[PDB]
Amino acid sequence: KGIYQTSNFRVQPTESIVRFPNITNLCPFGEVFNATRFASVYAWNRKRIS
């Protein structure tokens, strides 16, 4: 007999939400992996990807 504090079990999730930026531009995989000429290790090339 008495009053008891209880932990959380009653709530359970049932759905999921995804929210990404809406972009339709395929990313330049062919310009870095299929490049005709690669750089020397000492002068290694760096490319921004955005």
Partner 1 sequence: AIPTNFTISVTTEILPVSMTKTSVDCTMYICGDSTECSNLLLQYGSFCTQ
Which residues of the chain form contacts with partner 1 (CB under 8 A)? 5, 7-9, 11-13
Among 30, 35, 28, CA closest to 49:
28
Q: Smaller CB distance to ligand NAG: residue 14 or 34?
A: 34
Least Å distance, CB 2 to partner 1, is: 14
**Of ligand NAG, partner 1, none, which one does residue 12 interact with (CB within 5 to 8 Å by kind)?**
partner 1
Evaluated on CA atoms 32, 36, 42, 48, the torsion sign reads negative
Residue 34: how many CA atoms within 13 Å on its side-chain side? 5
For residue 29, state whether it binds ligand NAG (rule: CB under 6 A). Answer: yes
